[PDB]
């Protein structure tokens, strides 16, 4: 009802998050994994979707979409085409390592979630597109998959259910745009990581031109624990429309950076000081914070105090949760420089098939380098705003929104810094 801060280990869902117990099948069974999955499967798929819905579980990929409805767009009769499930593990969003931690320290949960979601959707296999820089993680994942095939939990008779299911892993060759539902699919299919438009929707025609449902590592890894303990239990955590135990990644200008699970709608200040050791110099030295990943607008110290780290509160704070990768900056930062490096990152990682991002992101990178130097005039800030707004809702994917938003945040809270840089540059001439 209130004070959604603390969370006991009895309720933590990623138990081996710090590599303290064996990540193989022995620790998985000893910790509560691959238990009763047979009954989970012999239960109908509609029941699994009912659980996903009554849990309030919203995807963690960066957009707040409810799974149950997402995974229910796919609970249709088959038209003689194999249905699939594609797991998104290409966490290239700056500040995000939760999926790495999962992959490498508790992969049997991910595998069990693949199987559960597959029975929910009617799938035939699970394609786990994983980043290519994560070679050791993918190897651990394949080891786990081999253990599972040997134990009989996936394959011909998955746990003794009459349901046959495979799990494939796929490396990505290092691209951030391949993290989108659609460019992911194109990569798998062999083509460039160039997203496709919607419609069509992956559920109708997706990977290999077949029905498809893309989902984040955390979502699927949670699904079996929900179906096993209960969605209402998952929904007692957090606020009404946003609920669950969410992984957090606290990076930058913080003394004890870490990854953590907590109750959503938690106060950000607590989330920092209690788990981390607080910002290096003290809350007073906090210049600004990025609540989610690089694709989320900044918010300054002023509102960072009374802000709840969930979707809706961050929206009302003119920002968003995203992947919940709290990047912290103190007063010793050229914040303009950090945002300009973010824009350079988005410039490199753009695919280049739709004009707005392709051109305007490099445009904004040049303008931002100029602002760093201060060679610009303060009449160009509104030009940059207009450029951002021309990019925002006119793209095929969100990477344009992600490149436009941090600029909007910078200009919405740190315009005087830019104007002062311009004034100093004019004096220096």
């Amino acid at each position: 009802k209130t004070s959604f801060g603390s969370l006991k280990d009895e309720d933590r869902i990623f138990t081996n998050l710090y590599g303290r117990h064996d990540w193989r099948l022995k620790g998985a069974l000893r910790r509560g994994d691959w238990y009763k999955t047979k009954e989970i499967l012999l239960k109908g798929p509609d029941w699994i979707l009912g659980e996903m819905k009554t849990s309030g579980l919203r995807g963690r990929g960066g957009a707040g979409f409810p799974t149950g409805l997402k995974w229910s767009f796919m609970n249709k009769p088959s038209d003689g085409r194999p249905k699939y499930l594609v797991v998104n593990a290409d966490e290239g969003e700056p500040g995000t390592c939760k999926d790495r931690e999962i992959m490498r320290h508790d992969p049997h949960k991910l595998v069990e979630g693949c199987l559960v979601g597959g029975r929910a959707m009617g799938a035939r296999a699970a394609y786990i597109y994983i980043r290519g820089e994560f070679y050791n993680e993918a190897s651990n994942l394949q080891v786990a998959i081999r253990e599972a095939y040997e134990a009989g939990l996936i394959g011909k008779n998955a746990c003794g259910s009459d349901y046959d299911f495979d799990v494939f892993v796929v490396r990505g060759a290092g691209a951030y745009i391949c993290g989108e539902e659609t460019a992911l699919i194109e990569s798998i299919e062999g083509k460039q990581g160039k997203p496709r438009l919607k419609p069509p929707f992956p559920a109708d025609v997706g990977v290999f031109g077949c029905p498809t449902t893309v989902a984040n590592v955390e979502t699927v890894a949670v699904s079996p624990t929900i179906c096993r303990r209960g969605g209402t239990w998952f929904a007692g955590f957090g606020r009404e429309r946003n609920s669950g135990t969410k992984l957090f990644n606290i990076s930058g200008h913080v003394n004890h950076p870490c990854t953590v699970e907590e109750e959503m709608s938690v106060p950000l200040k607590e989330l920092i000081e209690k788990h981390a050791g607080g910002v290096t110099g003290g809350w007073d030295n906090l210049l600004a914070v990025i609540p989610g990943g690089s694709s989320t607008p900044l918010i300054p110290k002023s509102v960072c105090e009374t802000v709840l780290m969930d979707f809706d509160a961050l929206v009302q704070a003119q920002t968003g949760l995203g992947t919940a990768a709290v990047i912290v900056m103190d007063r010793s930062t050229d914040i303009v420089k950090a945002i300009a490096r973010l824009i350079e990152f988005y410039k490199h990682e753009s695919c280049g098939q739709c004009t707005p991002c392709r051109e305007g992101v490099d445009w904004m990178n040049k303008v931002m380098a100029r602002f760093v130097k201060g060679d610009a005039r303060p009449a160009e800030i509104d030009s940059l705003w207009e450029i951002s707004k021309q990019i925002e809702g006119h793209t095929i994917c969100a990477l344009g929104d992600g490149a436009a938003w941090p600029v909007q945040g910078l200009i919405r809270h740190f315009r005087p810094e830019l104007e002062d840089r311009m004034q100093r540059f004019a004096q220096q001439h």
Binding site: R81, E186, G190, K191, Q192, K194, R196, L197, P199, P200, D204, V205, G206, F208, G209, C210, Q353
Partner: protein, 87 residues
């Protein structure tokens, strides 16, 4: 790809000789109607004008493109050849 000059009917005359001028090398004509072009809203209007003025005419019907089925999903198919390799 503009289709705004494919709306109004035109009237054009037969082409006649054009010979270089020896002095400069320009194109000369003894054809006053070499550049006569009239614009009509329909075919019967042009036919009437031609008949009236005493000219002989050969008409050419209007070419409208045929409506075409188009789908962005066809580019992504499981079994058909519409499957494209160039995204």
């Amino acid at each position: 790809s503009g289709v705004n000059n494919t709306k109004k009917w035109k009237m054009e005359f037969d082409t006649r000789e054009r010979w270089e001028n020896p002095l400069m090398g320009w194109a000369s004509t003894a054809d006053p109607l070499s550049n006569m072009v009239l614009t009509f809203s329909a075919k019967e209007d042009a036919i009437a004008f031609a008949e009236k003025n005493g000219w002989s005419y050969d008409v050419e019907e209007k070419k409208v493109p045929k409506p075409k089925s188009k789908s962005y999903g066809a580019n992504f198919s499981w079994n058909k050849r519409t499957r494209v390799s160039t995204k």
